[PDB]
Amino acid sequence: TSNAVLTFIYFVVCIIGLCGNTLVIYVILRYAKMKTITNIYILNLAIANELFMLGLPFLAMQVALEHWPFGKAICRVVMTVDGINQFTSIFCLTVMSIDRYLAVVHPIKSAKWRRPRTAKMITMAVWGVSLLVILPIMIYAGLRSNQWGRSSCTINWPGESGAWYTGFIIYTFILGFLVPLTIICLCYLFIIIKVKSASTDYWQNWTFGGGIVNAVNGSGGNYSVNWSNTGNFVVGKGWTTGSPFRTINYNAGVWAPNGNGYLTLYGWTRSPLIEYYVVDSWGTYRPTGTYKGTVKSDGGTYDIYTTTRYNAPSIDGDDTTFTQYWSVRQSKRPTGSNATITFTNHVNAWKSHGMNLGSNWAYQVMATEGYQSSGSSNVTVWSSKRKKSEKKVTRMVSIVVAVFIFCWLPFYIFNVSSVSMAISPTPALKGMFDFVVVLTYANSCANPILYAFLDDNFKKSFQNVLCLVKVS
Amino acid sequence: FXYXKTCX
């Protein structure tokens, strides 16, 4: 019997998801360490899955007896519990990713928002809207019995049988799959962008003229220069597309000019064509220009200057004319440890002086720039260094999202085809429905197994609890 | 379709 196989599968899924999701609800409530923001969202996934793995034995016995014998009260609780598992589950996963977005993309502007009282308040809102969403299931859960006396537990819609069917699946498809995945996946888009634009991606090594310029392209944002020159050179690492909100970080392990050299951030806009500098250290010559004012940023104090370069080479060609905005520190910045340039502060300052930058952002790099000199410099460059702790958690949610999509999409795909349908179901199609549904039920015993493979903290808690051996 | 998330 395909019932025999199906009943067996139901039952092993249930056994495994009960162990899996009880352990997960345990370790989070039993350890202080395990109570975290992501974990608070995770507990509710496990609660919903647990609630559901409890109803499964009844559904298993329906398949094995081809008959619902438990009564109308237990049917209502199983349908509510099966519905909870379809909507509360992913509604927990959407809130989980929005949380991931906010903590990577906007770590600064939503720290107050990311507190456990707000997680707990939010997670009582995840239930309220699930129960609102599954109200058709709750209200209309009941027994339908065929002419041969066998009752099946289902949702007896009030009208004609398929009338509410096409209505219902499209409701469920839109609430339980479309809208939440639309939300989820663009959360990870914007996260991919902030992760991808954090490190430097542009290497510049432009030696004009005579002398010696040995430029080294190291790992990450590292580079060094060794020069004793007679020309002009610019070496540095940065971003092919600059930003007026990027806060640039760097560390100049060596900044030893003998002669004319600048340590400086610099870049271009077009529309209008402007080259800009934020100079932090120099050699024997502090660059100036037409004085304009001062700005205080990142501990230190800079003068603002403008210059105009006539018939000079630019990113727009060999013979353009353009303005240059400068922020030159009034004294040489100490070197050797992590130093920040909060670029906005310079943009705002130039703006208040009527120096506006362009619409169209070209490159933006943290360069060593020498002018007929010698010297050495070693500089590492970056922007918004990621927290390794946070990386692994954002990786785990991404994969829990992945298995969910994998385990449920054949189901919504099977359900949406089935409205168009014109022929009565075939055994092959019937066996496909039961496989596709088993795929969804299996989803609620994966999450825990994944927590043990993708979270170290979950792995040791599981080992602590089941008295296993911790061997570094 | 079937009766609910099962075709027997």
Author numbering:
A (entry chain A): 41 to 237, 1000 to 1184, 244 to 333
B (entry chain B): 2 to 9
Authors' description from the paper:
Somatostatin (SST), an inhibitory hormone that distributes widely in both human central nervous system and periphery tissues negatively regulates multiple hormone releases (growth hormone, glucagon, insulin, gastrin and cholecystokinin) and cell proliferation through SST receptors (SSTRs). There are five types of SSTRs, namely SSTR1–SSTR5, which are divided into two subfamilies: SRIF1 (SSTR2, SSTR3, SSTR5) and SRIF2 (SSTR1, SSTR4) based on phylogenetic, sequence homology and ligand binding profiles. Here, we report five structures of SSTR2 and SSTR4 in different states, including two crystal structures of SSTR2 in complex with a selective peptide antagonist and a non-peptide agonist, respectively, a cryo-electron microscopy (cryo-EM) structure of Gi1-bound SSTR2 in the presence of the endogenous ligand SST-14, as well as two cryo-EM structures of Gi1-bound SSTR4 in complex with SST-14 and a small-molecule agonist J-2156, respectively. The overall structures of SSTR2 and SSTR4 possess the canonical seven-transmembrane (7-TM) architecture with an extended helix VIII in parallel with the membrane.
To facilitate the lipidic cubic phase (LCP) crystallization of SSTR2 with its peptide antagonist CYN 154806, the flexible C-terminus was truncated to T359 and bacillus subtilis xylanase was inserted between S238 and G243 of the intracellular loop 3 (ICL3). Three mutations, D892.50N, V106ECL1E and S3168.47D (superscript numbers represent Ballesteros–Weinstein nomenclature), were introduced to improve protein yield and homogeneity. CYN 154806 (Ac-NO2-F5–d-C6–Y7–d-W8–K9–T10–C11–Y12-NH2, disulfide bridge: d-C6–C11, numbered as in SST-14) is a selective antagonist of SSTR2 and shares the same backbone with the octapeptide agonist octreotide (d-F5–C6–F7–d-W8–K9–T10–C11–T12-ol) with inverted chirality of the fifth and sixth residues. Structure superimposition with SST-14-bound SSTR2 indicates that CYN 154806 occupies a similar binding pocket to SST-14 in SSTR2 with different binding modes. K9 of CYN 154806 anchored in a similar environment and forms a salt bridge with D1223.32, a hydrogen bond with Q1263.36 and multiple hydrophobic interactions with F2726.51, V2987.39 and Y3027.43, as confirmed by our mutagenesis data. However, the main chain of d-W8–K9 pair in CYN 154806 rotates ~70 degrees counterclockwise around the Cα of K9 in comparison with SST-14, which may lead to an antagonist effect of CYN 154806. In terms of the conformational rotation of d-W8–K9 pair, the side chain of d-W8 is tilted with the main chain and inserts into a different hydrophobic pocket formed by M1193.29, T194ECL2, I195ECL2 and F2085.38, thus losing contact with helix VI that dominates the activation of class A GPCRs.
